[PDB]
Amino acid sequence: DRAEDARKQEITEQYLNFLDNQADTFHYRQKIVKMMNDGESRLVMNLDEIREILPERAEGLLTQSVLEMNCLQSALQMAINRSDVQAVVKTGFHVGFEGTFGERHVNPRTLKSSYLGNLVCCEGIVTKCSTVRQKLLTSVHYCPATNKVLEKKFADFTMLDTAVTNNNYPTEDENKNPLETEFGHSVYKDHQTFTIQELPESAPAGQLPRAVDCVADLDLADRVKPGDRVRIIGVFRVLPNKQNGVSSGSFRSIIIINHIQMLSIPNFEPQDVKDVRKISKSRNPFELLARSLAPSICGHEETKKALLCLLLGGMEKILNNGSRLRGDINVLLIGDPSVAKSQLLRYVLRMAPRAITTTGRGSSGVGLTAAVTRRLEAGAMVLADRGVVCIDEFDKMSDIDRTAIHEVMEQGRVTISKAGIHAKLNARCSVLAAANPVYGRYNPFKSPMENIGMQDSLLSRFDLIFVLLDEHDADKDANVAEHVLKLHTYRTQGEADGTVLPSIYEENTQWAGIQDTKILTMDFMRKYIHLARSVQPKLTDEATEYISEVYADIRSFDITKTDQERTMPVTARQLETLIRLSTAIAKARFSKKVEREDTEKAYNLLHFACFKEKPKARQ
Amino acid sequence: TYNTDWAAEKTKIRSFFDEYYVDNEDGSGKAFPYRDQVFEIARRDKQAIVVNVDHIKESDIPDALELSEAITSNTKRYEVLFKDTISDMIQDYLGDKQAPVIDALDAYMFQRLHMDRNLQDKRKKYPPQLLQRFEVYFTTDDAAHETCVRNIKATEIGHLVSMKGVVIRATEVKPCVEVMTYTCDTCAAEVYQPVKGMQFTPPVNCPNKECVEAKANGRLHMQLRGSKFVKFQELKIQELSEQVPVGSIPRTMTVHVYGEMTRKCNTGNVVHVSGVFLPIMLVADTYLEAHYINNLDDNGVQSAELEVLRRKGDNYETLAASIAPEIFGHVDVKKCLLMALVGGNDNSSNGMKIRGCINVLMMGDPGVAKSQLLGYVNRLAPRSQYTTGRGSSGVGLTAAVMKDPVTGEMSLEGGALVLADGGICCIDEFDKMMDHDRTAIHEVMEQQTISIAKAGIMTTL
């Protein structure tokens, strides 16, 4: 026994010397200082870093994990006591691990009884969750008959500590005086359990997927929900059971978690910040970004400018009396078949964080907004709050479902009042929609409003509407066909001919078709848009005067002069569209002020959207 | 590492009550309002004191910050010390006089203390819940204690917590046991049992020493003239919409309310609550024990800005202009909404009733600020509901029959027009409601009743 005590003293001394080395080469003392300044209570270590300096500790920490981990946490407490900073937290300090596992990287299928008592790392999908509940750890009692204070500690099989005690709640003194609980001094901890299942990409065909149960406490609780793809590090252990003194030999097993990694976004370095400064200081950054958006699709330049404005977004105003004015931008595409509407929707789904895609073919309005299931259930536009919804085949939706969207696209709210449920829900998001015209193909002998075939109250809620036509014209046909075949004959420069798929500027651009002008890399696009989204520009007087004159001119213009025809309704919402597009353009310049240079581009884009010349079949 | 010298803490608390003050508005002197409220309890014009912890924090007293932190960190214990100091202050004010008898428990206590006559004996014979007959509650306003329902976790057990929310469910007031009193058959002695929590177990055999030694086997019979009861109520409170994270649904919590804080809320109200977070007597269930409640729907006093208007008169044009000043024009529409916000008189000649309130229908082309006007009216009115044509059923507007799966019972659940009673209901997108949903409001708009005959229910609302 005394040899065991000497060995535990040696192991704790080794871990303490590693943690509090005089000149710390791994900077865990500075990380402890960061932890105590931030008020956190567990420290993350690299097992690969322990492996270099103390390999006899590191490999023993996998096989004999319980004793080694207890010794390491004791050494952490002594290292904290050597600081001039105070230990505020009433729960102890803890350790989590990362690194290379090798043998002990497993699945729910391959976790079997050979691994019991070892440290393991496992992967899967969360399928259940308990609600967070509080669990007693120590209890403090006051004896009013004697002015003494009594304390008691509690332990459980699910805890890492192997020690066990009576677990009876104390009520009386040894002299049988009654006792009073001190709730402000007793100690509790947050507790949660969940389960993980095999990933569907790894489960063998036909069979059912296998699953494992998990226990998490303290700061690890309230971190996951169903559907999360996770990697989990902990000790695999077994739990006995009893009924009336008779025991079945089949015991249950769990994972007691040390650390959780999420698998399902930005990254920066000062070289990247320098390059963002340079490109922002260049001559026409908005045009460069609009050209660089989606290079493998020919044409569609004005729609690409509109999509860039959608990805940047406008400014919300909340006034002094609580009134709100909308910030988001909404875009609709109608046109002939095979004109890349769905392709652009899928591209925006890749580029935008917090994005959801649906179709009008298989969506109810209840499922699109919110549902009663009694409980209340979120829909797609609620889930995409402060984000983007892409809707395809928007003409195939029913009007009963369409009328449910009218509140969301303007007020940013979903309100329900049905049996037993009365609630608001926030649904602030941007809508991007694609559709085909009424007749399945655009009729040139009828007006654009007749071909679109939707009511004015719905059409007014879109900031921009684009009508896309597939006109037969030998020049355009030749150019489009040449672009498509050039994209199809392409192969990477460092690739052999028989292979199969199972910096700032781009360098190979034959696939893009654009001959000489440069194009930015998509990773740089993601970084630039992420930074430029946070700029908060203000308006100015020249912008205000230009917007106010231009709005009246757009409303008063008469189309019988020019043989054009009107594509949109014009209401007071389009004035706010001008304001939103001006702020979105000013964001790309990293400007703090909106100017005439921004408002002129916004007007040119809106005036392109508003009017269209009559088709050649009618002319 | 604990402090249990209660006398020093009582000295600090009594110094706070003695030395907090506010200057008189005419400058004539100083008011000492907490000891004025103590004397109101002593003369029995009152039943509770509400103490503001921030006044203790910002008082000009030594150890004031330490006292405030100790109150906040172990609030369930400091309530007893506040009650003890107020009891000592009451006896110092009262002297050799007697407080007036007003109820049967007061009559029993005043009669029995002098039957005992005909401080150690008093404190040993009677428990302090029976000797002291008033309530103490705490409040906070500093933003350090502001939290959501979602954030109250294991660190908050036993602490004072403040939050803001919406009331979903509320029970009616019930009598709750606080102290039971039993009397023995044979030896005529009495047993006092204080009750804590939601359960108690009655003792069976008499404990008095003469009865026990004689083995007289006297039973104990409980008596409700000596026993103490208190008003009890239960609520469920939901998160406010601004508190919820992105793309998420609000959570709820159970609240227990006692005494003078009962009947301050009904369903469809928004409240500010201060209370203590506690478990139920190794995994535990929890609730909130309310200390103070404030209706933000409700909250002879007049503001100076109103006094200027009331002296001015001719206010009609300014009142019309002040409704949603971000919206340009529509002066006559704002006047119509101003009249709908006030309404006429109810008439009840010879048994025949006539509706007093005014109904307005707005129509217009798209983009002319109808929804903005309805939102401003919903913020301006005291009790009001907002609905849309698509998001509401004809049962969610009027009232619903609910079948409880736990018990099998049937019950009624009031809809939007029931919750808005005495106020205004705003209905947006009114043309897109179904006909068989729309025809439910025919009785409400003219007779102001809802009448139901379904399953095993037949009522009028």
Binding site: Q207, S296, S363, S364, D392 | -
Partner: protein, 184 residues
């Protein structure tokens, strides 16, 4: 003796006949099990494949080899060969992918051994299903659909989506489709 068998297997078992812990249910404690029942190639197989590829009439020979019990239908058999082999699959630097699958439809009278052609393709294909969801189950494979007069997102996007009360998900799978109709 664990994880040695899967449902559907035919077995013979040696074991002890036991009663589970005055009436008990029985069970068998197993002492012995006896079972009653691609992607790798040899140089001989590679030389055979290359000999067929070296032949000039290889494409016509494969088209002839499709369903020899059924007369004629030469261009249809050529089309089925194109369906089996498919095109290349591409992903450009902007991330927009280009499909490799090929899809074929058959119309006309309900006879003339259409179902037998579909069953032949089901047998020959490396992965595949025949049927009258089912659309999901053939990543990298071929699905034959009979009686097609009984999805646009599935064909073009290789994905279907849903948003009904309380669910929204997307199911993604890559396959080629051969369809037979009796006649949108």
């Amino acid at each position: 003796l664990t994880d040695k068998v899967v449902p559907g297997n035919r077995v013979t078992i040696v074991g002890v006949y036991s009663i589970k812990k005055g009436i008990r249910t029985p069970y068998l404690r197993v002492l012995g099990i006896h079972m009653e029942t691609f992607t790798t190639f040899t140089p001989e197989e590679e030389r055979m494949f290359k000999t067929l590829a070296q032949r000039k009439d290889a494409y016509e020979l494969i088209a002839k080899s499709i369903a020899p019990s059924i007369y004629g239908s030469a261009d249809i058999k050529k089309s089925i060969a194109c369906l089996l082999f498919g095109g290349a699959r591409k992903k450009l630097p902007d991330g927009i992918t280009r499909r490799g699958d090929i899809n074929v439809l058959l119309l006309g009278d309900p006879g003339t051994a259409k179902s037998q052609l579909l069953k032949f393709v089901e047998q020959v294909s490396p992965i595949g299903v025949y049927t009258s969801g089912a659309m999901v189950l053939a990543d990298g494979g071929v699905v034959c659909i009979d009686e097609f007069d009984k999805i646009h997102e599935a064909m073009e996007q290789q994905t279907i989506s849903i948003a009904k009360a309380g669910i929204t998900t997307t199911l993604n799978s890559r396959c080629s489709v051969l369809a037979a109709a009796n006649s949108m």
